[PDB]
Ligand binder design. Structure first.
Ligand SMILES: [Cl-]
Lengths: 4, 127
C-alpha cells in the first residue's frame, strides 16, 4: 500500500 | 515495482549508524537498498545520482538529524522525495522543518519504544  | 525497495538519504556525519546499523539490518532482512557509497555513479552529476536513487526505489528513507538539515544533497533529495514516498526516521533530535512538522515519523530517539522500531520500519517497506 502506497503512502497517502 | 522498482529495482530497490528503499533508497537511504542521510548526511555523511551519520554514516556510522546508517551503514553499519540501518543498511546492515535492511540487507540482512532481504530488503534491497540503494546506498550512495556503493551505488552512485562516479562522473554523473549529483542531481543524476539523486534521481537514479529516487526513481529506482519504492520509497526513500530520510535519516533526520541536525546534520541532515544542513546538507545540500539531503535537502535536494528530500524535496524530490516529497513527490514520492518517504519514510522519515528521527535518528538524532533536531529542528524538523515546517513542511515535515505534520508527518508521522519513526522515532529512534524514543528509547522505550525502540523495541518496535525495526518491526515498524520493515513492515512499512514490505507493505
Ligand atoms: Cl537542529
Amino acid at each position: 500500500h502506497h503512502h497517502h | 515495482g522498482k529495482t530497490y525497495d528503499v533508497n537511504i538519504c542521510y548526511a555523511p556525519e551519520d554514516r556510522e549508524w546508517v551503514i553499519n546499523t540501518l543498511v546492515f539490518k535492511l540487507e540482512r532482512a532481504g530488503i534491497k537498498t540503494f546506498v550512495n557509497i556503493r551505488d552512485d555513479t562516479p562522473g554523473n552529476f549529483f542531481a543524476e545520482n539523486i534521481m537514479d536513487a529516487i526513481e529506482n526505489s519504492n520509497r526513500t528513507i530520510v535519516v533526520m538529524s541536525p546534520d541532515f538539515f544542513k546538507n545540500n544533497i539531503c535537502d535536494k533529495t528530500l524535496q524530490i522525495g516529497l513527490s514520492h514516498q518517504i519514510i522519515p526516521i528521527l535518528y538524532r533530535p533536531c529542528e524538523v522543518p515546517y513542511f515535515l512538522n505534520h508527518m508521522t515519523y519513526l522515532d529512534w530517539c524514543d528509547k522505550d519504544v525502540r523495541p518496535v522500531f525495526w518491526r515498524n520500519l520493515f513492515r512499512d517497506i514490505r507493505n
